[PDB]
Amino acid sequence: MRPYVILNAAMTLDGKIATATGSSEISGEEDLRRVHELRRECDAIMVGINTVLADDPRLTVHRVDAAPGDNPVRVVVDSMARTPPHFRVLNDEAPTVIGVSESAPPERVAELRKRAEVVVAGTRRVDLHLLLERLHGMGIERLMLEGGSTLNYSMLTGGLVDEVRVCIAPMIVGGRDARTLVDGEGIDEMADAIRLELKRSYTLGEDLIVEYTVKG
Amino acid sequence: MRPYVILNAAMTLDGKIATATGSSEISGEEDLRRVHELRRECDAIMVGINTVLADDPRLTVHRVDAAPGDNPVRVVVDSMARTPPHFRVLNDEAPTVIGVSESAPPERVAELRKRAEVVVAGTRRVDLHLLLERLHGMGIERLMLEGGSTLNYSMLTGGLVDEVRVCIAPMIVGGRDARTLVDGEGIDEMADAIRLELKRSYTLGEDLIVEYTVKG
Numbered sequence: 001m002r003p004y005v006i007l008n009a010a011m012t013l014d015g016k017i018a019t020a021t022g023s024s025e026i027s028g029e030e031d032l033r034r035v036h037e038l039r040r041e042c043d044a045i046m047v048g049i050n051t052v053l054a055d056d057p058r059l060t061v062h063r064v065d066a067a068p069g070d071n072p073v074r075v076v077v078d079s080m081a082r083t084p085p086h087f088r089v090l091n092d093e094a095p096t097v098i099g100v101s102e103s104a105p106p107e108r109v110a111e112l113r114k115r116a117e118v119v120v121a122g123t124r125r126v127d128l129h130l131l132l133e134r135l136h137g138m139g140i141e142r143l144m145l146e147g148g149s150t151l152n153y154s155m156l157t158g159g160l161v162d163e164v165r166v167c168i169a170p171m172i173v174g175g176r177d178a179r180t181l182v183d184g185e186g187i188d189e190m191a192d193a194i195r196l197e198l199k200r201s202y203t204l205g206e207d208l209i210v211e212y213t214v215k216g
Numbered sequence: 217m218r219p220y221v222i223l224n225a226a227m228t229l230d231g232k233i234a235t236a237t238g239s240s241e242i243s244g245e246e247d248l249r250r251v252h253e254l255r256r257e258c259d260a261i262m263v264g265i266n267t268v269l270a271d272d273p274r275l276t277v278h279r280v281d282a283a284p285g286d287n288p289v290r291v292v293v294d295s296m297a298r299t300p301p302h303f304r305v306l307n308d309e310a311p312t313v314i315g316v317s318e319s320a321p322p323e324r325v326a327e328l329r330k331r332a333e334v335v336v337a338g339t340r341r342v343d344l345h346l347l348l349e350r351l352h353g354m355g356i357e358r359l360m361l362e363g364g365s366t367l368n369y370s371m372l373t374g375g376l377v378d379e380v381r382v383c384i385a386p387m388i389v390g391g392r393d394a395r396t397l398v399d400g401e402g403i404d405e406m407a408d409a410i411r412l413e414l415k416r417s418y419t420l421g422e423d424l425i426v427e428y429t430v431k432g
């Protein structure tokens with residue numbers, strides 16, 4: 001089985017979540033609160049290793065009032081155990097899980113096990129199906145997927161996403177090499193696109209929030 | 217003095233206007249009718265050569281009932297005069313203008329002049345400011361820019377776009393090499409993004425339409 005999965009993101013109108021140089025300040029203050037409230041509501045947050053290396057995020061509830069138990073499990077998708085042992089995601093604010101592949105150097109895995117629960121799943125790339133099974137077995141029923149574009153693609157095409165919520169900021173940056181909402185290999189034909197259904201749209205500060213379910 | 221410029225587009229939720237393979241069927245029938253209605257309220261439609269080569273579009277008012285002079289002037293941005301003499305954009309449905317650079321081979325320029333007005337503007341690349349100035353001279357006061365992503369970038373960073381209208385389809389395709397709403401070289405810092413203001417957002421058929429003004 002697997003938890004229920006909400007993909008949440010912030011993007012520019014032209015669909016970018018970061019520039020080629022990694023600049024990613026997009027959301028207004030209100031959206032950031034929305035995000036932290038949603039964190040409060042979930043059992044776990046999931047990000048890819050590339051996001052962790054780029055942003056060194058806390059991935060906790062800190063922009064809204066939080067009870068001592070409110071921080072969800074932090075989950076990093078990290079095939080070669082590259083999460084720096086010093087980085088904030090391994091701090092003491094909340095439990096952390098690192099999903100690694102069987103190819104991960106045994107020495108790096110052992111260091112991570114000192115600050116986290118490590119789950120091995122997949123040969124050389126993290127098996128997201130298995131990882132999600134393992135998270136569900138830890139009692140995680142509600143997971144918030146927070147990117148980046150490569151993990152987003154894997155999760156969507158694997159049929160592992162139930163909802164998509166996007167903050168669309170009123171700005172354009174362009175860039176053929178900027179990260180978009182969803183990157184990866186890509187679906188070749190518009191006909192074979194993943195299909196969604198708009199459930200809600202509303203303004204929040206300067207931003208436009210859109211909320212969709214993924215059509216089964 | 218240049219025309220007032222509305223940029224119109226259709227993209228997937230993840231910001232794609234075409235897959236890597238050039239698949240670009242995005243809008244529902246209702247959006248397409250709206251586009252044709254807006255075309256009729258404009259003096260000119262502008263598109264890049266690459267769009268012409270990819271789609272061979274007519275660029276006329278035909279998804280709604282139209283009369284004779286309802287079709288706007290068709291303008292192709294085409295540095296090296298690559299518009300094929302047999303392409304629909306050069307048919308007799310409507311006036312056509314091709315903007316070329318000084319670098320375009322004369323044989324191709326001379327051939328284009330048989331089927332369109334040719335405006336030579338810019339050394340190696342079309343000078344968009346100069347082109348728009350010359351378009352004003354042909355009674356063009358309102359122009360609809362219809363892509364693609366490279367031309368969009370140039371027009372936007374050139375300060376030559378007054379409004380943005382986007383049809384957002386409830387679908388995701390991903391693809392690191394798919395064409396986005398705006399490609400080109402990109403703005404390096406989110407701080408330096410072109411800023412917009414949302415005028416209104418509404419559903420149209422299955423799609424979500426958003427209309428913005430460009431602040432700068």
Ligand SMILES: NC(=O)c1ccc[n+]([C@@H]2O[C@H](COP(=O)([O-])OP(=O)(O)OC[C@H]3O[C@@H](n4cnc5c(N)ncnc54)[C@H](OP(=O)(O)O)[C@@H]3O)[C@@H](O)[C@H]2O)c1
Pocket residue numbers: 008009010011017018022024026047048049050051052054055077078079080125126127128146147148149150151152154155179183
């Ligand atoms: N605004 C937003 O909504 C938002 C949200 C998040 C991030 N961002 C930004 O956007 C950028 C996106 O980062 P990114 O796309 O490079 O990184 P990412 O998607 O966070 O990380 C993807 C990486 O995860 C690892 N991985 C392991 N198994 C995988 C699997 N089955 N599927 C997918 N990935 C797997 C791979 O690296 P290994 O194989 O080496 O482990 C892969 O390259 C970042 O700069 C970030 O700051 C924006």
Ligand SMILES: NC(=O)c1ccc[n+]([C@@H]2O[C@H](COP(=O)([O-])OP(=O)(O)OC[C@H]3O[C@@H](n4cnc5c(N)ncnc54)[C@H](OP(=O)(O)O)[C@@H]3O)[C@@H](O)[C@H]2O)c1
Pocket residue numbers: 224225226227233234238240242263264265266267268270271293294295296297341342343344362363364365366367368370371395399
């Ligand atoms: N859904 C939508 O809204 C929408 C709209 C339009 C297109 N599309 C699709 O999206 C794709 C995007 O097309 P694209 O980006 O490859 O092509 P494009 O933007 O239509 O064409 C850009 C080309 O115009 C020429 N050009 C000359 N002077 C220029 C200047 N100053 N600035 C920019 N371009 C200049 C260049 O080629 P030369 O130098 O060789 O002349 C340049 O590569 C196409 O496949 C199209 O079918 C989607």
Ligand SMILES: [Cl-]
Pocket residue numbers: 057058059060
């Ligand atoms: Cl955070």
Ligand SMILES: [Cl-]
Pocket residue numbers: 273274275276
């Ligand atoms: Cl057409």
Ligand SMILES: [Mg+2]
Pocket residue numbers: 175176177178180391392393394396
């Ligand atoms: Mg791209």
